[PDB]
Ligand binder design. Structure first.
Ligand SMILES: C[C@@H](N)[C@]12C[C@H]3C[C@H](C[C@H](C3)C1)C2
Lengths: 30, 30, 30, 30
């Protein structure tokens, strides 16, 4: 079922959760 | 089929805009 | 012509070139 | 003939590994 489309996407969402922790640079470092 | 293709890309604009605020750190440099 | 599939990846490569700037994150330490 | 869909998923694996590199920046700080 066109698993090719879901595979990339799946990683796409995986990056967001990682983003929040990375944002801490901004918050802290004004 | 459920819009799998657009569903993933939808988030993409989010990651793009969030990117800019990141660079904001290098400014002060320190 | 399923422009959705081709147009969405475009951003994908755009992030890689910007990525290298991040190296500056630790370049200044120790 | 241009597997765009699979083309993205192939790149991401590259991002995931470099991604952790940032974590040095924050952890040390907090
Ligand atoms: C880069 C990402 N938004 C995707 C990855 C794959 C190719 C394009 C459509 C869809 C699946 C999402 C672009």
């Amino acid at each position: 079922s066109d698993p090719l489309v879901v595979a990339a996407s799946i990683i796409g969402i995986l990056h967001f959760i990682a983003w929040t922790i990375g944002h801490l640079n901004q918050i802290k470092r004004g």
